[PDB]
Amino acid sequence: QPKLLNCQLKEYQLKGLNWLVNLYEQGINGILADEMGLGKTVQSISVMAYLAE
Ligand SMILES: Nc1ncnc2c1ncn2[C@@H]1O[C@H](COP(=O)(O)OP(=O)(O)O)[C@@H](O)[C@H]1O
Ligand code: ALF
Ligand SMILES: [Mg+2]
Numbered sequence: 046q047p048k049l050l051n052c053q054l055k056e057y058q059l060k061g062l063n064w065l066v067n068l069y070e071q072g073i074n075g076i077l078a079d080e081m082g083l084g085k086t087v088q089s090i091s092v093m094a095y096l097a098e
Contacts, residue, residue: 047094058088065092 046054046062054062061077065088068075079085 047091047098049094049098050091052087054087054091055084058084058091061088062091062095066095069096 046059061079064075065077069092077085077088079088
């Protein structure tokens with residue numbers, strides 16, 4: 046995970062970042078459709094922080 050976050054991703058989010066990164070580096074787009082309140086707003090920040098770090 047990007048150390049830039051000053052935060053910890055949960056298990057179900059860290060694998061979710063890997064999905065986000067894999068689609069990005071393979072040049073394709075996707076839907077993060079997780080159930081409400083699971084933290085989709087957080088996984089969103091984590092992929093930007095990866096593109097930064
Ligand atoms: N890894 C995490 N560490 C701390 N708080 C988290 C984490 N993931 C989610 N949250 C908390 O979950 C709450 C709701 O998540 P949010 O992403 O807004 O739901 P939604 O997926 O509807 O956007 C937020 O206040 C956020 O602080
Ligand atoms: F349940 Al949400 F943004 F997906 F509040
Ligand atoms: Mg949201």
